[model samples]
Target: MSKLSLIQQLKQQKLSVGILSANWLQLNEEVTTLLENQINVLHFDIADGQFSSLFTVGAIGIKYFPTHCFKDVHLMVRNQLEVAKAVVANGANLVTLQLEQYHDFALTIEWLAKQKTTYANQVYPVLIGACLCPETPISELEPYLDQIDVIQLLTLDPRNGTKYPSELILDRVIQVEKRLGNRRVEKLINIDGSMTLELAKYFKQGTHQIDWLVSGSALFSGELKTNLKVWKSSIM
Candidate 1:
């Protein structure tokens, strides 16, 4: 694939490249390669070891990531506000707080709304999101649906490892659409957790109503360009 061909072709949905599976040994090179391929968004799974078991790239790593596109930071931490403040201070374009993380999330939601971040040296208003765990009911998200910019769906949750049906993510997407459609609010739909070509194909088909796939290991598995092409062809 030519430098831009793969990036040009897959316009269905973009990927927020995950750094968890990225080569920390050659981190800069891997990131540069991804940038050369026109991959913009970078996903930082912030696990403070409280909400998620594995601690992903530390909060300071967000500062090191190139400000090319949306720096999507998913906080798998117990304290959303504190972590949000730290990452937003670094350069996270979008910060996500899991719905299951809080009993009352509204206060934090209001706080996160007033944040900003720089992307490729341009100051942009940061987007705040409400993330829903696999078992959390979609109804729990409706009240704050109008206020957020992104709705992140965690397709795979490892804690219980129930091996939810493939339709689980699909059903969740549909549920979100119904809620937002009635309220007439536009929010970006993002999917994370074990991003596979099969999952990418669903979102890539154009009718899946998904915006971004938080791709980490799947994308870094082999050749970035070729991997992207295969996923693109499958959807095409």
Candidate 2:
């Protein structure tokens, strides 16, 4: 699918099933099987050793993934522009860069503008997203209100994978929603990291603005298609 088509689909759907994992073999299987079963999106976590200990596939390796699959690349690296450019070149439909990594926020905006123009001409535009850590305040995103296509809220600490979501994240979603409500353009909010079935259930009924939910180990551990059905049913 084209990048714009997937973004529009996300606007209508209350929840989207994003298949995520660090293990490439398991991820490849899950993508091959569940996509036929109607999974909404494919998410790749690009973690550099500096930002995250668990280093998964880089942009060069991601070229092997299904080209037609709607792909979201979460860049957990210090050099946001370079990584984003590489991922886009390698067929990433959406690129989410870390908000805290860049030294100057204006430089990030300029980089995104160039990408927007370049990809829009390709007829396969790329959606740029800003990722915020759990500890980041919502007000910090004010400058980027008009620049980003999506805002990702990381429920877990990036330094460690074991850390879980905090209760404050729910409130942060509300804050982001309220902020977007007053803006001329609307942006999608995605929740990443350790999204358990219980937490997914809670979010289904609790918030109407959260566009995507990123779940890794829980969603891909076993029974790919069946587990996805359970996840959708639990929300409905």
Candidate 3:
């Protein structure tokens, strides 16, 4: 399905979970169970040592993923253009580019637009998105707001977790909501970092504009379906 349709799909559910694990053994286990349980999105983190101290998996690792799943590539790298291209070529449905790392944000957006056109399909299109650090101002995303399909707001640092129930994230959501206005239908705001059960309740109690919650241990550590059930129930 196209990015627009994908946004609608997630909106229908109100909230959905995406895996953030890079461990090969656990990736296979979690992803297989996730797919079986009808969780369609898989979040892959490609971190260069420079951007974030964590050097996770890359394109080659994604090659092993099931084609039916939607790959949400979170690129925390220096060479955004090259890394994005490689990941898209490897079958990434949604790519999240770091706003702080790229030198020319406009150039990167332009390149991604071309790549989307190059890989466009009637049923599915390559989606390009931008990610902002906790310290980055929400206004920085205004220029590319019309061009991107998703905008990720980091609650903590990019690579690791921090204190939960961040007050900054709530403000970020409110700021972005005001900026996007009616344009929100075409764009989605995703939260990435330190999501716990308590945090999930906090998000659900908020404005509910947030679309995707990119979670790692909280969603994938225990029984996949049971954990998902508990998460959804708690949020409700």
- Cα lDDT listed for each candidate: 0.74, 0.71, 0.74
Model 2 Cα lDDT, one tens digit per residue, 1-236 = 55446566656644444554535557677677765766546778887776767576578756766765667788887677778778888877778878877574457556655663222234455777888887778898888877888898888776754554466778888888778776523567888877788887777566355778887778766777777788767864
Query: Best by lDDT, which number?
Result: 1
- Which lDDT tens digits does candidate 1 get at residues 200-232? 776666665676788868877987668777765
**Cα-based RMSD of the predictions, in order?**
5.2, 3.3, 2.9
Better of 2 and 3 by TM-score: 3
lDDT sort, best first: 1, 3, 2
Give per-model TM-scores: 0.87, 0.84, 0.87
**Candidate 2 residue pairs in clash (backbone atoms < 3 Å):** none
- What is model 1's C-alpha RMSD? 5.2
What is the Cα-based lDDT of residue 127 in candidate 2? 77
C-alpha displacement of 220 in model 1, angstroms?
A: 1.7
Instruction: Give residue 232's lDDT in candidate 2 (0 to 100).
Output: 65
Query: Candidate 3 residues 1-236, lDDT tens each?
Result: 66677678755543334554434567677777666766767777888786888787778756777777667788888888888888988887777888887595667677777664222333456777898888888888888888988889887775556553477887888888888889888987888876777776777677647887777667756677788788656764
For candidate 2, the TM-score is: 0.84
Q: Local error of candidate 2 at 194, Å?
A: 0.8
* CA lDDT, candidate 1, residue 55: 67
